[PDB]
Each structure stands twice: as structure tokens, then as C-alpha cells.
């Protein structure tokens, strides 16, 4: 069970750790988060009390280093940092645990939610989508645009998701125009799975990462990416059976975790109605269709 300690909390902030959140008051004696489960990526995220504008946060994996959060009064945000001195980090963290100045990662034993949301998400792939090679952790915020959004502007601060575009020469074989547009199996299986992602686990990892950035930061291009990656599968007539079954599980937990009050902005009516009721896979997503119909029947 690892620990993300804090130098201090100088400004009032709502802090998120994965699907949990808590409020910290200005100059409150808060020194971090303990009992963080090993084996999963995590995200620690922030919304200042005085400017709800810009949610922002850091994806990390405690197996890759000792990380601490320190507020910067010049740039005006909580920054993640790496401590190279393992023995300083251990001594400082032990002090905070003894003075009980840390919140405990509050996982219910029954509860597989975070695993189910991050099953295929790997730090190494996050770091290829979010390019800042000098750090082991990755910063994301509400405003960051995607490479495809930029094609339609600062490339260093972009989300380099895999570009998906249904009316593109990559997606459409010369001479198969109607076939490939109406049945995207070629584009899914040959171009994307065999060619770009290599396997469905890497495809699902990017889909899950895109959803989580949409949910936690309201990142609009991330939401576009999540929906494109769903729609590409649903619009393929030929999809491996294991992929369909896993997609249903992935989406089910995503829809389950989505705040009820953000569904209007985080779910695209067209895509979901097409996927659940018109597409090749309209009958392949039983769990997802059932929770959607019971939780958001208005969207449908």
C-alpha cells in the first residue's frame, strides 16, 4: 500500500483520487493520501475552490517511483514531483502517518470498480498519449486538445490519441467504398487492431483512458475519442467474440460510475442509440443496454 504525500495544502481545493474525492480547506493540516492499492494506475486530481475552471491531475503508478504533491505559488497549481532520495521520502512519509495527517484511500473490500475501469490501462501507454518524457507521471487537464482536434494548437500539451476517422483513406479501401463504410470490420481488425494497436488489450486501454479523462476532467476531445472507439467496434460486423463480451463489461462499469448529472454532456445520444439499437452489435451488449435503459432512458 503506497503513499502520495503533500508538502502542504495552501489553497482550498477539492481533491480526487480515482473515483473518490474530498474537500481540503485553505491551509488545512493535510499531508496526503495513504493505503493506495498497488497494482493499478491511479489518478490524483484537483479543482480549486476559487476557480472551478480547469480541473487537472496526474496519472501515476507507485511501482514506478516515489511521488509527492507540492503546491507552486507561481504557476498556481498542485504539482506532482518525484523524490530520488528513497530514505528521505520514507522518513518524511513515516512522520505524516504517525501524526495521522493523511486520508486513507477508501476502498470497500467488495468493490472492484477501479480495477474494472482501468483493467487494460498501462502507464507506459498513458505516457505515449501524454508526452512529457522527463516525468514518470502524466499531467492532464480539462482544456488539453487532441492531435485530431488540432488537425481541425501547442503540440507539446496535446493528447496523442490514435486518430479514428470514418471518412478517411485509412478507413476505406479503394474499390471497397460502400463495403468498408457500412461495415467497418476492415478498419477495426486490419488497420487498427493488427496494424496500430497490435491487440485488443491496447485498444481497450486507450478507450478506458479516454473515458476516464472525459469523466474526471470534462476533457471534450477525450469524450470524442471514447465514443469513436465504441462506434468503430459497434459498426463492425466481424468482431472477435471475446472482444464483444469484454466491451460490454467495460461499458457497463463506465455507465455505472458516470455521475448521473453529467450524462447530458458526457454521453452522445447519436452514438449510443446507433450502437444499442441500429448497429451490427445492437444485440451483443446486454449488460450495457440494460444499465443504459434503466439509468438514462431519456437519452434513448
Amino acid at each position: 500500500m503506497n503513499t502520495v504525500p503533500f508538502t502542504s495544502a495552501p489553497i482550498e481545493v477539492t481533491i480526487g483520487i480515482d473515483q473518490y474525492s474530498f474537500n481540503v480547506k485553505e491551509n488545512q493540516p493535510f499531508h496526503g493520501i495513504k493505503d493506495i492499492p498497488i497494482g493499478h494506475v491511479h489518478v490524483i486530481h484537483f479543482q480549486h475552490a476559487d476557480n472551478s475552471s480547469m480541473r487537472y491531475g496526474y496519472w501515476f503508478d507507485c511501482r514506478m517511483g516515489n511521488f509527492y504533491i507540492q503546491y507552486d505559488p507561481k504557476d498556481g497549481l498542485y504539482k506532482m514531483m518525484e523524490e530520488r532520495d528513497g530514505a528521505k521520502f520514507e522518513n518524511i512519509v513515516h512522520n505524516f502517518k504517525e501524526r495521522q495527517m493523511m486520508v486513507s484511500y477508501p476502498k470497500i473490500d467488495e468493490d472492484d470498480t477501479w480495477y474494472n475501469l482501468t483493467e487494460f490501462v498501462q502507464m507506459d501507454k498513458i505516457r505515449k498519449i501524454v508526452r512529457k518524457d522527463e516525468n514518470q507521471f502524466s499531467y492532464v487537464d480539462s482544456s488539453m486538445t487532441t492531435v485530431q482536434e488540432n488537425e481541425l494548437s501547442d503540440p507539446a500539451h496535446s493528447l496523442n490519441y490514435t486518430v479514428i476517422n470514418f471518412k478517411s483513406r485509412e478507413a476505406i479501401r479503394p474499390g471497397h467504398e460502400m463495403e468498408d463504410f457500412l461495415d467497418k470490420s476492415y478498419y477495426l481488425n486490419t488497420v487498427m487492431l493488427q496494424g496500430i494497436f497490435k491487440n485488443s488489450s491496447n485498444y481497450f486501454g486507450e478507450l478506458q483512458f479516454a473515458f476516464l479523462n472525459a469523466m474526471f476532467f470534462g476533457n471534450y476531445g477525450s469524450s470524442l475519442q471514447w465514443h469513436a472507439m465504441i462506434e468503430l467496434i459497434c459498426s463492425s460486423a466481424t468482431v472477435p467474440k471475446h472482444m464483444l463480451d469484454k466491451l460490454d463489461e467495460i461499458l457497463y462499469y463506465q455507465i455505472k460510475t458516470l455521475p448521473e448529472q453529467y450524462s447530458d454532456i458526457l454521453l452522445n445520444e447519436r452514438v449510443w442509440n446507433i450502437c444499442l439499437y441500429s448497429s451490427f452489435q445492437k444485440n451483443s451488449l446486454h449488460n450495457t443496454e440494460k444499465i443504459m435503459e434503466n439509468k438514462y432512458p431519456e437519452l434513448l
Partner: protein, 237 residues
């Protein structure tokens, strides 16, 4: 974006463009079977591809054999249309290829866009104009070449005959759409207006009769009367 009354003179500028109408590509007669069920029988069709500035009509004849053994023919028809337009464009010298293609039905946008991905600088556009190009098969010489075809074939016409010698392409298009609207609203009457006079003929190399300027004014008036009439005969007014 879309083409409407606000940007109508754009049709007659010097940017090459083509209207594409697919409403006569897939044509059927519906009939009863010996068992009292219903069935369709396809008949020859055509793509109506028209340069509004020059009058040049690229009439691609769609022979019924293209449908043999196919499913979802109404969907296939839009894609076949787009395949044939894309083939036409690629067959033209670069300096003759259109800068824009305007489809008369929005369902042609995605099929055409996908077939023209190789041509990112050709704009594919819809229109809000309700153009009467479906009535092209009421022009006797066009209907004749379509019904006589025994194989796929492209035939080239000038739908303006020789009018551009005397009038502008804006006026020629306005005449064409008036004639076609009339043929669409009441074909028998429209045809009587056009052809009930034997002293005014159709030249072998033309589609419409050889009216003088004055006779066109008379003809054009008679067509407006027809359209307004039928609009009363229709709505009772």
C-alpha cells in the same frame, strides 16, 4: 455548405461545378405475382449529372443488369451513383474537373464524399433548392436512349440546346427548371404546350423545339400558368 436562394448566381460563375441527381438511378414497376404477392421489376435508369453554366449533361445510363443478385438496391443505388460520378471526374482532364459537386438529395453526401476522398479539394455540397431534375425522363430523347440501352453507357447532351447563343446561363437554367417543373407537375399538359405546333420542330441535334425568342416568352408563360393552375387544381384555390 448548402446551396440556397441566397447564393444562386454562384451556379453561373466560372468555377466548374456539377449538379448530381440520383432520383432516376433505381427505377421499378411494382406488380402482383401469380400467388397474389407483390414484386418489383427494375427498369433502366440514369444518373443526371449537369454543368449549369454550360448545359453539358453527362447522362450515365444504368442498365438493369447492375442490380442482378444484389440486395438493398435503394442503398446500393446511391453508392453506384457515387462510383460513377467519381469515375467520370477521374476520366476528365484536370482542368475540366469540377471544383464543387452539388447533390440534389442529402443521402448522396456520404456516398459521394467517400468515393471522392482522393479529391479533397472538390467540395461536396447539398442544396435547399427543390430542383425538378427527376422530370429528366419526361424529355423524350433522354427517356428513349435510357430505355433502349442494352448495356451500361454514357451519353453526352447539351440540355440548353443552342440557347446560350442568345441568352445567359442564368436565364437558360431558369428556363430549364421552369420546363422541368411543368413536366413534373402535369406531364401531359406540359408536353402539349411544347409540341402541339407542327411549324415549330425539334432539330435532330436538340432536345427542345426551335422556338424564337418571342415564342419562348409565350411558351414560358404557358408553363407558369400550368404550374399555378395545378397548384389550384391541387389545393383548390
Amino acid at each position: 455548405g448548402a446551396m440556397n436562394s441566397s447564393n444562386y448566381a454562384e451556379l453561373f460563375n466560372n468555377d466548374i461545378k456539377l449538379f448530381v441527381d440520383d432520383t432516376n438511378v433505381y427505377r421499378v414497376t411494382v406488380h402482383k405475382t401469380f400467388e397474389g404477392n407483390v414484386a418489383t421489376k427494375a427498369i433502366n435508369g440514369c444518373i443526371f449529372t449537369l454543368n449549369p453554366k454550360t448545359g453539358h449533361l453527362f447522362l450515365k445510363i444504368i442498365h438493369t443488369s447492375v442490380w442482378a443478385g444484389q440486395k438493398r438496391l435503394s442503398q446500393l443505388a446511391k453508392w453506384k451513383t457515387a462510383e460513377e460520378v467519381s469515375a467520370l471526374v477521374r476520366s476528365l482532364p484536370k482542368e475540366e474537373q469540377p471544383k464543387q459537386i452539388i447533390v440534389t438529395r442529402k443521402a448522396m453526401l456520404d456516398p459521394l464524399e467517400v468515393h471522392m476522398l482522393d479529391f479533397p479539394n472538390i467540395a461536396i455540397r447539398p442544396t435547399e433548392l427543390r430542383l425538378p431534375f427527376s422530370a429528366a425522363m419526361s424529355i423524350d430523347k433522354l427517356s428513349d436512349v435510357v430505355m433502349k440501352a442494352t448495356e451500361p453507357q454514357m451519353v453526352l447532351f447539351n440540355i440548353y440546346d443552342d440557347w446560350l447563343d442568345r441568352i445567359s446561363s442564368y436565364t437558360a437554367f431558369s428556363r430549364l427548371t421552369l420546363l422541368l417543373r411543368a413536366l413534373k407537375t402535369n406531364e401531359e399538359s406540359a408536353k402539349m404546350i411544347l409540341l402541339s405546333d407542327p411549324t415549330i420542330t425539334i432539330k435532330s441535334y436538340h432536345l427542345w423545339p426551335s422556338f424564337t425568342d418571342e415564342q419562348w416568352i409565350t411558351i414560358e408563360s404557358q408553363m407558369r400558368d400550368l404550374i399555378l393552375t395545378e397548384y389550384g387544381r391541387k389545393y383548390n384555390v
